[model samples]
Target chain A: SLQSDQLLEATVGQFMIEADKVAHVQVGNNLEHALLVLTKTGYTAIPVLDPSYRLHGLIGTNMIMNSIFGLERIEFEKLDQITVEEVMLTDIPRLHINDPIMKGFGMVINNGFVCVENDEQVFEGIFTRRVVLKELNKHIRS
Target chain B: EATVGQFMIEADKVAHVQVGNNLEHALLVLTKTGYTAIPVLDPSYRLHGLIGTNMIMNSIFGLERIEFEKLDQITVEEVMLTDIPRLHINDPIMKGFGMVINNGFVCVENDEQVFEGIFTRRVVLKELNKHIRS
Candidate 1:
C-alpha cells in the first residue's frame, strides 16, 4: 500500500551524504586523539570503520558528553582505557526503501537514531528528525 | 561545496519505531528524550518515514473517525511526510542556516536521503555559535 506520489518524492536516494572520513582505531590507537580529531572535524558524530572500510558503528557527542563526564566530574584519564567499541552502540536501527515516511519519523522521535550499515547490511545512509521535517516542509510549502 | 559524505554526522546507534506503534507510545518516547522529533520505522527497523508531535497536533486531529480509524490502523505509510530537503556537509553553514530558516527550522538526511543525520533549529543555532566563535 504505497503512495505512488510518495514513492516518487520520498526515495532515500534523493538525499545527501555529508558525514565522511573514517576514524582509525588500531589495537593501540589512542581514544583521546581519535575523539579530538572528530571534534576538530566539526562533527557531532563520526562513523567507526575498520581498516577494510567496514562499518563498525558510530561515535557521537552525546556518548562523549555522557560517558566521559559523568555527573560528578570529567575523568580525562579514562580515555586511555576506553575503546571506541566499548562506548559505541551496536544495536542501531536501519532504514530501507520499502519503508514509508511515517515509520521513519516514529523512530527519530522515539530514539536518537543516527543510521548505519555494514558489509552484511552495507551502508545506505541515515534518517534523522531533520530529514523528516525537511520533507514535510517540502510537501507543505510546494 | 562539501558533499553529504563530507559533513554528515556518522552515527553509532539509531532509535526507531515500527508503524504499528500507537500515538500514545510515540508521545511517551518524546517525553523521555530531549529531541523534538523522531524517525518512524517498520517492523524490521527500516526507515519508513517520520511523524512529529507538531505534525500529530496539526494533522491527526483534523481527520474524521473513519480517517482516524484508518490512521489508527494505518502504518507510517499513511501519515509520514516523504518529500524532504537535504544539504551536503560542505554546502556552507550559510546555506544550511538558510535552508533551516526557510523551511521553518528543519534539516534532513543530507545527500542520499538515506538517513545521514538530523538537525534541529537549536542544533543549527549551536553550530552557528561555533561558527561565530571561530
Candidate 2:
C-alpha cells in the first residue's frame, strides 16, 4: 500500500515529462505557425519558449478559438501576422522541480496544469492533471 | 441563477467532424472550428466518440513512418477516443464541474442516448468564476 507520506514526499520532477520530450512553440512564431505545431503535436497546449528554450507563456487551441471567434471578426490574413506571444496565457502558476507532488496537485486542480521550473528559473516541463491522475490511479491499484 | 444547460454551448452550436471522414477532413474541421476536441457522430447523429487535436497528432507520430497520404486514408473513427465520460442534461452544474476538473470535458446525453452537447473545462470555469464574482 502507498502511504500518505510517500505520496507527499514525491516531487513533480518524478512524474513530469522531461523538457527534451516536450514539443513547444517559440515566442515570435505567428499564430498560423503555432496552430500548425499544435495540430502536428496533438497537444491541447504547447509551452511558448524563447530562443534559449526559456518559458514565455503557453499557446493552446482555446486561445486560438477565442481569437478567431471573438465578437469582432479577425481577417484570416491578419491571423497569419499575429504572433503567439501576443495571445499566449502568461499568468500561469508555476511549480518548482523539487516541490512536493501534493503542491502540484492543488495548482493543477484549478489550472489543469502547472509550469515546472528548476531552481535557477530555467524552464523544465509541465505537471498536468493527466499525469497526476495516472500516478494516483497507479498508487491506488497497488 | 444559471443552470448547466444555460451555460452549455448547445448541440447545434457545436461543430463536429463525422465518423468515417478522412483525417485531413478532421484536421480542417478542428482548424476551422478551433475546438480542442470535438465529438464524432455517425450517419444517424449518434455520438460515437470524441476526437481531439492531440489525438490526431499522436496518431501521426505513433506511426512507424510519417505519411500524409496514409493519414488521408485514416478515418476519424479509427482515432477518436471512445471511453470518455458523459453527463446528463438535468444534472446540476456542480456535478459537471467535478467531472471537468478531471476529464477536461464531458459529453452530454439524453436518456435516449441522443447527444446533447458537451461541457468543457472552460465553460465550467467561466460559470464558476462568474458565480464567485457575484
Candidate 3:
C-alpha cells in the first residue's frame, strides 16, 4: 500500500495523456474544421497547437455553439471564415510536468482539466478530473 | 448579475439519450447534439444518470479489440455516471458556481426532485465574463 505522502509526491507526468496521443486542433484551422474534429473525436474541448506544435490555447464545442446559436441567424458558410485562434480560450490553467499529484488534482477538480507543459514550455498533455478520480478509485480499491 | 436560473439551459430544450437506448443510438444522439455530456432519462423523462462521450470512448478503447457490431448490445444505463452531484433550482448563483468549479457541471432540480436543467462551468464563466465587461 502506498502512503499518503508518497501519493502526494507522485508527479503528474506519469498519468498525463502523452502529447502524441492527444487530438488537438491547429491554430490556423477554420471553425468548420475545428468543429469537425471536436465532433469526430467526441471531445468537449481540445488543445490548439500552432504550426510548430507549440500550444496556443484551447477550444471547445461550447464556444462554437455559442458563436453560432448566439448569432441573429445561423450562418453555415460564415463558420468556414472564422479561425480556431479566434475562438480558443487562452486564460485556462496550466500545470508543469513535475508538479505534485495533489496540485494537478486540485486544478483538475476546479477547472475540469489542466494543460500540461514541460520545463521548456513545450506542450505535454492534459490531466483531467475524470482521470484523477479514476486513479483515486484505483488506489481506494487496492 | 444574472442568476443561475436565468442562464441555465432548460430541461425542455436539452437533447438527452434514454436509459435503455442502445450504445449506437446514444452515440448518434451525442454526435448530433455536439455535447460532451448529456443527461440520461427514463421513459417518464426523469433523470436517471448522465452519459458522456469520454465514458463511451473509454469503454470502447478498453476492449481487447474493436467490434462495431457489439455496440448494439450495450445500453446507456450500463455506462452512465450515477454518482453525479445535483443542485436545487432556488440555490444561489454562487452556490452553483462553487459546485461547478469542482464538478464541471451540476444537475438542477426542484425540491420535488423534478429535473429542471443544468448549470455548467462554461455557463458560469460566460456569465462572469459578461459581468466583468459590463
A53-135 per-residue lDDT for model 1 (tens digits): 55566665446434554344445566667877777656666655345444555555543444534336455456665665455
Better of 1 and 3 by TM-score: 3
**DockQ value for model 2:** 0.17
Q: Which candidate achieves the best TM-score against the true structure?
A: 2
Q: Docking quality tier of candidate 1?
A: incorrect
Docking class of 3: incorrect
Per-residue lDDT of model 3, residues A1-142, tens digit only:
5554477668888788888888888889998787767766767899998877778789986676555542343344646788998888988788889998767766753576788988666799998765665565445444
Model 2 chain A weakest 10-residue run by lDDT: A69-78
lDDT of 2 by residue, B1-134 (tens): 44566667689988887878987678667867766678998777779998876777567753443333455778999999999888888887767766765687788888788888887766754443344336
lDDT of each: 0.49, 0.74, 0.73
Q: Which is the winner by lDDT between candidate 2 and candidate 3?
A: 2
DockQ, candidate 1, vs. native dimer: 0.02
> DockQ of every model listed?
0.02, 0.17, 0.09
Q: How well does each candidate superpose onto the true structure, as a TM-score?
A: 0.42, 0.60, 0.57
